[PDB]
Structure formats: C-alpha cells, structure tokens
Amino acid sequence: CEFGYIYRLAQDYLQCVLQIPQPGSGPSKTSRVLQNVAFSVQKEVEKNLKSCLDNVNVVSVDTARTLFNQVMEKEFEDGIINWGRIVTIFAFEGILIKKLLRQQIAPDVDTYKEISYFVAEFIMNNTGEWIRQNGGWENGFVKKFEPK
C-alpha cells in the first residue's frame, strides 16, 4: 503493498541522503537494505551524469516532479520492470533532493516530504502490481538484496 509503506521507504531514503535520520527506533530491515543498495547506485549515477547534473536547476518541487517524470519515462520505456530499475527510482529521488537542498528558491525544509510523495505515487501506480507479484518488499526486494 500500500502507499503508506512505500511513502515511508521513500521518506527514509531522503532522510538518509540528507543526513537527518528520524531519531527513535530507526528504519526497518527493508529500509536499511534499500538505503545501502540505492546509495551505491546513486553514487554511480551522479558520477555518470556529472556534466548533466552540473547544468540542471532544480528550483522547486514542481520542477523536481517534471524532471523525475522525464527520467522515469526513459528508464521504463521498454515496459519491463525489475528490481534494479526500482532501486534506480530511489537513486533519482536522492539526486533530486540534493539538488533541491542547494537550488530551491525560498527553501522549505519539509520539501523531502513532497518529493517522497510523488516518488511513492509513481512506484505505486506504475510498479505496484509487479512488486506484489514478485513478493513485495519483504519477500521480494529484501530477499534479493539483503546481505549474503
């Protein structure tokens, strides 16, 4: 799976990138596994996209949503879904939140909550069926990516 679960994953990942994990009992096992794998992918994508990223201006949540939709169209154009592509969604929201921290006009500290929202909406609406059919986060994602 439902929106709330995926929203919590997307928010936890933005708090990880922004170095502001929520004080308390901490993230779930699924969220901890995803943070590790998505960060590794994010570092590689930032290096590969360096020139592109140096000339982008993520000045608002609306612009971050437009850019996110454009990358997502190119990422899933062949219609296939797999777990690596789903990790790449999280890597792109991590890049967008870093850019918005630096370039947002009239910055708003709760902006990661709006970015998490549209990332969860995309994941639920476009990959939600595939995820449930492949075991969800607990019996699909975690089983594939948890430490050996």
CB of 4 to ligand A1ILY, least distance (A): 25
- Report the alpha-carbon distance of residue 93 to residue 47 in Å, rounded: 16
- Report the alpha-carbon distance of residue 80 to residue 2 in Å, rounded: 21
Which one of 23-31, 32-40, 90-98, 111-119 is the stretch in contact with ligand A1ILY (CB under 6 A)? 90-98
Q: Is 44 an interacting residue with respect to ligand A1ILY (CB under 6 A)?
A: no
Asked if 141 and 33 touch (Cβ cutoff 8 Å), the reply is: yes
Asked if 97 and 17 touch (Cβ cutoff 8 Å), the reply is: yes
CB of 61 to ligand A1ILY, least distance (A): 13
- Report the alpha-carbon distance of residue 136 to residue 142 in Å, rounded: 9
Q: Is 81 an interacting residue with respect to ligand A1ILY (CB under 6 A)?
A: no
Q: Is 75 an interacting residue with respect to ligand A1ILY (CB under 6 A)?
A: yes
Report the interface residues with ligand A1ILY, using CB under 6 A: 49, 52-53, 56, 67, 70-71, 74-75, 92, 95-96
